[PDB]
Design a protein around this ligand. Structure first.
Ligand SMILES: *[C@@H]1O[C@H](CO)[C@@H](O[C@@H]2O[C@H](CO)[C@@H](O[C@@H]3O[C@H](CO[C@H]4O[C@H](CO)[C@@H](O)[C@H](O)[C@@H]4O)[C@@H](O)[C@H](O[C@H]4O[C@H](CO)[C@@H](O)[C@H](O)[C@@H]4O[C@H]4O[C@H](CO)[C@@H](O)[C@H](O)[C@@H]4O[C@H]4O[C@H](CO)[C@@H](O)[C@H](O)[C@@H]4O)[C@@H]3O)[C@H](O)[C@H]2NC(C)=O)[C@H](O)[C@H]1NC(C)=O
Ligand SMILES: *[C@@H]1O[C@H](CO)[C@@H](O[C@@H]2O[C@H](CO)[C@@H](O[C@@H]3O[C@H](CO[C@H]4O[C@H](CO)[C@@H](O)[C@H](O)[C@@H]4O)[C@@H](O)[C@H](O[C@H]4O[C@H](CO)[C@@H](O)[C@H](O)[C@@H]4O[C@H]4O[C@H](CO)[C@@H](O)[C@H](O)[C@@H]4O[C@H]4O[C@H](CO)[C@@H](O)[C@H](O)[C@@H]4O)[C@@H]3O)[C@H](O)[C@H]2NC(C)=O)[C@H](O)[C@H]1NC(C)=O
Ligand SMILES: *[C@@H]1O[C@H](CO)[C@@H](O[C@@H]2O[C@H](CO)[C@@H](O[C@@H]3O[C@H](CO[C@H]4O[C@H](CO)[C@@H](O)[C@H](O)[C@@H]4O)[C@@H](O)[C@H](O[C@H]4O[C@H](CO)[C@@H](O)[C@H](O)[C@@H]4O[C@H]4O[C@H](CO)[C@@H](O)[C@H](O)[C@@H]4O[C@H]4O[C@H](CO)[C@@H](O)[C@H](O)[C@@H]4O)[C@@H]3O)[C@H](O)[C@H]2NC(C)=O)[C@H](O)[C@H]1NC(C)=O
Ligand SMILES: *[C@@H]1O[C@H](CO)[C@@H](O[C@@H]2O[C@H](CO)[C@@H](O[C@@H]3O[C@H](CO[C@H]4O[C@H](CO)[C@@H](O)[C@H](O)[C@@H]4O)[C@@H](O)[C@H](O[C@H]4O[C@H](CO)[C@@H](O)[C@H](O)[C@@H]4O[C@H]4O[C@H](CO)[C@@H](O)[C@H](O)[C@@H]4O[C@H]4O[C@H](CO)[C@@H](O)[C@H](O)[C@@H]4O)[C@@H]3O)[C@H](O)[C@H]2NC(C)=O)[C@H](O)[C@H]1NC(C)=O
Ligand SMILES: *[C@@H]1O[C@H](CO)[C@@H](O)[C@H](O)[C@H]1NC(C)=O
Ligand SMILES: *[C@@H]1O[C@H](CO)[C@@H](O)[C@H](O)[C@H]1NC(C)=O
Ligand SMILES: *[C@@H]1O[C@H](CO)[C@@H](O)[C@H](O)[C@H]1NC(C)=O
Ligand SMILES: *[C@@H]1O[C@H](CO)[C@@H](O)[C@H](O)[C@H]1NC(C)=O
Ligand SMILES: *[C@@H]1O[C@H](CO)[C@@H](O)[C@H](O)[C@H]1NC(C)=O
Ligand SMILES: *[C@@H]1O[C@H](CO)[C@@H](O)[C@H](O)[C@H]1NC(C)=O
Ligand SMILES: *[C@@H]1O[C@H](CO)[C@@H](O)[C@H](O)[C@H]1NC(C)=O
Ligand SMILES: *[C@@H]1O[C@H](CO)[C@@H](O)[C@H](O)[C@H]1NC(C)=O
Ligand SMILES: [Ca+2]
Ligand SMILES: [Ca+2]
Ligand SMILES: [Ca+2]
Ligand SMILES: [Ca+2]
Lengths: 388, 388, 388, 388
């Protein structure tokens, strides 16, 4: 109909309720389920779907051997109905590539897929299911993007890209698209030292992205974008409650404008909802691996360098594998406020479970409730032994 | 379009004709069919669908081992086209949970799924395929609901929930929802001592639910609800024709306001159409197990404590397995009256057939006819030996 | 939109062109294809679909053992897209039963399925995908119907049913339905001695059905129906070109009002287009078994007892299996006339191919052309040896 | 809505970006994927789909043995969603045959399938999914057509057919269809000596087809059609950059009106975009087999007999198999010009990979970009060893 505008603020988050779960690996043991990774969720005005980068093979198929690798000519951004598994028969291909983002602006959906060799990659922007704009690599070192949904406001959908070294200073740009065309692009500004895989959401005409400093920070960089002025700034979450992985143990005081040191050249896509006292951070439970997952209410995490948790909810037990996590919201739901949601990728297979030769995942997603609901843990559920 | 109103009365039921049958287990022996249980049928203004709680695995898949268990993080309410089997590829997920109910109010559908640990469960009410309201457990002991469709009148859809002991007094509440929001809730009233798994239908602006007294009654409790005043009352079916299972043999006189004693702490979801002389009761043939199924016309069963059958129809022979049964009607069918329908869950596998490690079911459903049609028996049809 | 009216006459048939073919058995050797029999084709105003009675199991599934039997609780009328195979995932169930007919009246579709024991069967008439009317068996001996599409004119859709002995005089009735309700029914009139499995078509407000005399005739009975007056008459095709199977060899002169003797108690559903000189008969090539299939232009076959072929076209070689055949036409195609079409069931498995334990079929259908096209043979194509 | 008119010219082609890829053979190793060959892509006003001639069997099915053969009664033109693989469950059958073409005129789609014995074949033209016109073979020697999409302008869709010898002079005709009916047909004119498998596109009310001279030319014949006047002419691409296969090595000067000699009786369907300096030719890298694939910018290739490449892009490495290639464009995309696209069939199996008994393919397609994007190679990706 008309372009959507971020006119509401976030609802109060007192707990999280189960939204969707596909049980992909359990079902895939005996169904034609595609091997995937880097999943996310994104809504249209009339439907919310699951998205992920397919590996171009089923889990039980012999071509699943080697799916631990991130980039190949056989990957594609696919979407499928909420809570169904990604099957060969119900999946829709959005575009071909090994890195992506996608969002509905209210009238139609923009999907972006990046493909190519590490030194000669290119992004092609699709709008209304047709290719419209193409961008060639600027730093010649793995042009890459969000791996979760972008957000739009009055037709303008900013997207964060990074090109260059994953273990040093790189060239990050914020592109402002409207109907698939580039309106403008900026180099990263602010105090964030390295940006990767931004997870974003929007409220009251402002877009907040929580990203990943793969180089030196264990605290997460945050990019605030103004989609009307088409500007942005960046900093780190001040809180001592560290949310990257691997990471050091939590200190008593965090850092607001510098990476908090302790682990170098590694991390995991994650997210947060930063809204004053109504602030919730998500993180793996293990400081060493992508294991477990919890949500912690940390009032004023963004600006308070001594902020600690006042409430929490365990999503995945530390004895179960987790992985990437990102934010999304159904901007077209009825109501006075936007209900915060997120998904967690539950990775199975390599590298942790090496008895099988593949790497895949299932998804679990929750949304906020103003009630204080009881909690349950939501693991992948598959028994690796059945695949041997 | 507009909210549906229960403006008609029930058609005369002189017999039952076959409506739908999926042959799920026969087909599942060699197709990607999901393991299910607790099925039911529910109609929209333009389509009637099959519904059930999936176990998050196919029958032939290795994860089917252990599906005798009722609650896990891998269950979900799924719907699929009438008479098709519940396959991995044609099933739509309504919500995540191990107990549910769902109904169309005329404008859109409300689905409710309950999930969680036994002591910290929560129900989330979805309306128009988006979560809207959440209710946390009040007695901390398996919050649970109908396991069959709810009914609405002018936008108000009452739903019966029970929380607490399954073998003693528990806390049952009737919630009145409108567009997914709670308008009001009441504690159970009347003479019913224990309520579980209510099967409901509506006619002439009144909703009748036949439930299950798991604690002490072999006669069934009935809840009559007035969706305009938003009140209700409860009693037991007076008839000596006992319809729970397991149960004692039929006596000569029943009880109207007390459970009829003989079997404790057990039962089976069932239903009835209570309409003066046009009254039909459904029950398993066996008094000992979920075996066989018949429909008996018992004039004035609700109020006549000596009422006995004047006609009947066998649905499933006593040599074949049955299971849960519930009511539904297509409130949007053309005509002067509402045609009564019901479904029977045909359970296969554990605990009765222990050569296999799974438990699943297929469905058979019939609707009433004003004609006196010939009868046939409708068993599941699968040969367990083929799964060994 | 509005009820369709048979306002056109048949186009000139100078040859037949390939219309649809599903290759069901070839594909089913390694896909989830349902075992079927008694197929046909029927069109809606915007789509033509394949129809058949499913056996409630896939070909490769173990439950396919025994599918030679015609009646069970596991059969159902299913439809699927033109030229696709009948798979577990793309098939839609119209109704439950072991005998059927179905037709679109222009506004919506009526499907009729008969089920039950041999002595207590009943037909339930569905209209707009809801059950509307039910008819109980009148002679208590396998109530049965067309096994191909019915035809409607201004809302009235006559259907021919037979109940009683298959090897002696039986009770055949013509029911005139309108929006699923019975307007009237007549006992069979005319000179036909036994009626079964009528194949019908309509043109210029008249409906012609070519049926099967299972008792004593090798020539086919024809029923002409007037859907406005709601009357009919019957006779036999006069031509000496005999079209039932098994049958005697063709004589020099046929019979117009009596069965032509030679074979008793057996036959095969077949059809014909009777239109003066524009008359074409279809028949198996073999006089002994359901083997081969050809179309022969026999001018005035209906009324000329010495009429012989002036042209022909081989559809299936005598070295390949055929089976049932029936007529259908797309009454909603653009044009000045109705293009005649037909389908042939290509049966594989038992009883002729006894190395396998199942019986199934694939379909081939053609439509007429005013051109004189070259011919090709269209066999099922599967190699039975691959199923052993 | 209304008939589409070729009102735009081609966009500037500075490089090619990835458009779609199905990974059919990789996925088919463990999914119900149909064996195909002769694929192409064609768009409707709201969707672009993949098309191909099915072999009527899955790759893993036993009936795949022998799929190296081009013509049988089991082939059919099927279409399926962009970038999905051609599965038994998501494929739609357009028509039955072993040679085809298809195009949307703006209001609806015309599909043409040819079937029959080599000496008695016939084409049936379908329009709006109904058969409308039929054409019988005129030279009695494999009536055949494009094997890629046709193009329409104001309702007129020319299609090039060839009938007769594949290794000598044959009878090629250009048929001008409008709403499925023949408006007119012409014998081939101009200097092209032999025409087969034309790949066409349209811009500024002119249709250009690049075909294949199977008899004596290694340079490609070009047919220019005027769909308003309904006339055409033909010549050969002048350039010394030879694009058929097998072929001689490139000379220094080509031939404009004669086949360039060197290889007889063989070739491969191919295409080109001829637009002055904005001219790009596609060809296999190997001069000996259907191996590798590249696009070369050869300014004025059509008219300049000494024209050589000024830029290029490798699509498939010479160590990977290619096969047929053709043109298509989304004439309904937004924009000031038409974006040129093409697909390449990646054949696997026989005759080159003889360890398996089948022959199938996957597809890769690209579209032009005005940017100078980095290149990547896009091979089929399947490992034949997994099928043994
Ligand atoms: C039914 O359902 C309800 C609803 O879910 C259940 O109630 C919930 O129960 C939760 C489980 O306890 C509870 O969650 C915790 O909340 C704590 C906050 O509560 C207290 O908050 C303030 C401040 O303390 C108080 O004023 C208030 O009264 C509360 O007591 C959190 O602090 C908890 O998180 C911490 O503990 C968990 C482990 O239990 C850690 O995994 C988590 O990471 C937090 O601890 C680490 O981090 C902090 C801060 O840096 C450190 O101080 C601490 O040392 C830990 O650090 C180590 O570990 C981390 C992670 O590995 C590592 O990185 C670091 O380096 C260190 O090694 C927890 O989130 C819910 O709030 C509560 N909800 C409600 C509404 O009540 C109920 O139990 C269920 N019912 C039944 C019958 O089961
Ligand atoms: C073609 O189709 C038609 C249509 O289906 C067929 O006709 C139908 O045939 C049915 C089969 O007989 C018949 O159904 C029965 O109806 C009886 C009522 O009929 C009589 O009703 C009144 C009162 O008796 C008469 O006035 C009237 O004339 C009729 O005679 C029912 O009573 C039957 O139900 C009882 O029997 C069945 C077993 O046959 C039990 O399973 C059932 O539960 C009922 O009996 C138990 O319960 C009663 C009441 O408590 C007890 O009195 C009795 O002792 C039994 O109790 C034991 O068993 C139960 C269950 O296990 C257990 O809980 C308890 O503790 C005890 O152990 C039956 O329903 C249809 O009415 C009839 N339909 C029509 C329209 O005619 C026809 O046959 C078919 N044609 C052919 C050729 O086959
Ligand atoms: C390219 O394509 C074109 C188009 O398809 C091909 O041309 C077609 O070729 C067909 C094959 O010959 C031909 O079909 C035949 O037509 C005959 C009629 O043609 C003659 O008609 C009249 C009258 O004779 C002539 O005036 C006229 O000039 C023609 O000559 C039919 O008579 C043929 O049918 C009979 O033969 C076939 C076997 O060939 C039988 O299977 C069929 O059943 C008919 O014969 C039986 O029945 C008759 C009548 O009762 C008996 O008289 C006869 O003895 C047979 O009876 C025995 O067998 C039956 C069946 O088993 C059994 O029940 C009975 O008891 C007996 O045992 C045949 O239909 C097309 O007309 C022709 N089409 C056109 C437009 O030309 C062309 O060949 C192809 N090109 C190439 C290069 O291949
Ligand atoms: C990141 O991405 C970018 C974008 O893709 C990459 O840059 C591209 O790099 C390409 C790879 O080199 C390059 O493609 C080549 O372009 C040549 C034209 O460039 C020159 O053009 C003119 C004229 O020479 C110059 O004025 C200008 O400065 C350029 O130098 C083509 O000539 C190339 O094609 C020829 O070479 C390839 C093999 O490399 C052959 O396969 C191809 O067929 C051409 O050569 C055959 O045919 C010609 C003409 O007949 C013959 O002269 C020649 O002898 C060859 O003939 C033999 O082989 C053929 C085929 O087997 C056989 O039939 C015949 O009989 C003979 O046996 C090639 O197309 C892109 O233009 C360039 N793009 C851009 C925008 O720059 C970049 O590298 C990537 N970055 C990184 C870090 O990798
Ligand atoms: C968003 O705001 C623009 C004006 O700024 C308006 O035209 C548009 O309709 C608004 N969107 C909606 C959904 O109201
Ligand atoms: C997978 O591939 C590796 C490396 O190519 C090989 O050694 C291994 O055995 C393969 N695993 C399986 C199950 O085939
Ligand atoms: C149900 O009744 C309400 C008024 O009470 C009315 O507004 C509504 O339209 C009625 N529903 C229908 C389907 O008529
Ligand atoms: C199922 O699980 C049980 C208990 O975990 C195990 O003993 C049994 O063998 C399993 N059955 C099968 C068929 O694997
Ligand atoms: C069929 O005829 C009836 C009148 O007899 C008419 O009302 C109806 O519209 C006609 N159908 C069509 C499709 O014109
Ligand atoms: C099919 O069933 C028969 C009879 O029940 C049995 O003897 C036969 O072996 C079965 N065939 C197969 C392949 O199981
Ligand atoms: C194509 O041109 C014809 C007139 O020549 C016009 O009627 C038609 O609408 C045009 N098509 C479009 C899409 O404008
Ligand atoms: C395929 O068919 C050929 C020829 O009919 C036969 O020799 C060969 O063994 C078959 N291949 C396989 C794998 O069955
Ligand atoms: Ca880090
Ligand atoms: Ca009880
Ligand atoms: Ca007969
Ligand atoms: Ca050539």
């Amino acid at each position: 109909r008309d372009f959507n505008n971020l006119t509401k603020g976030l609802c109060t988050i007192n707990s999280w309720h189960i939204y969707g779960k596909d049980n992909a690996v359990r079902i895939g043991e005996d169904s034609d389920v595609l091997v995937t990774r880097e999943p996310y969720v994104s809504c249209d005005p009339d439907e919310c779907r699951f998205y992920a980068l397919s590996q171009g093979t089923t889990i039980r198929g012999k071509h699943s051997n080697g799916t631990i690798h991130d980039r190949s000519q056989y990957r594609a951004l696919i979407s499928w109905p909420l809570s169904s598994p990604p099957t060969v028969y119900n999946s829709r291909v959005e575009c071909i590539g090994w890195s992506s983002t996608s969002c509905h602006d209210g009238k139609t959906r923009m999907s972006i897929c990046i493909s190519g060799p590490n030194n000669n990659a290119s992004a092609v922007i699709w709008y209304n299911r047709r290719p419209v704009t193409e961008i060639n690599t600027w730093a010649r070192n793995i042009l890459r993007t969000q791996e979760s949904e972008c957000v739009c406001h009055n037709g303008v959908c900013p997207v964060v890209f990074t090109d260059g070294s994953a273990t040093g200073p790189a060239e990050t740009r914020i592109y402002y698209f409207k109907e698939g065309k580039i309106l403008k692009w900026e180099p990263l500004a602010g105090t964030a030292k390295h940006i990767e895989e931004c997870s974003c959401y929007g409220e009251r005409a402002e877009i907040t992205c929580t990203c990943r400093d793969n180089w030196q920070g264990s605290n997460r960089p945050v990019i605030r974008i103004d989609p009307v002025a088409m500007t942005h700034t960046s900093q780190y979450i001040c809180s001592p409650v560290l949310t990257d992985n691997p990471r050091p143990n939590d200190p008593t005081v965090g850092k607001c404008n510098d990476p908090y040191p302790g682990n170098n050249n590694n991390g995991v896509k994650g997210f947060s909802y930063l809204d004053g006292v109504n602030t919730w951070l998500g993180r793996t439970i293990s400081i060493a691996s992508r294991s477990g997952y919890e949500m912690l209410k940390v009032p004023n995490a963004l600006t308070d360098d001594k902020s600690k948790p006042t409430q929490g909810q365990t999503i995945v037990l530390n004895t179960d594998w987790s992985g990437y996590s990102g934010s999304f919201m159904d901007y077209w739901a009825e109501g006075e406020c936007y209900r915060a949601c997120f998904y967690v990728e539950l990775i199975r297979g390599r590298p942790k479970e090496d008895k099988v030769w593949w790497t895949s995942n299932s998804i679990v997603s929750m949304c906020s409730s103003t009630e204080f609901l009881g909690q349950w843990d939501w693991p992948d559920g598959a028994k690796i032994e059945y695949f041997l």
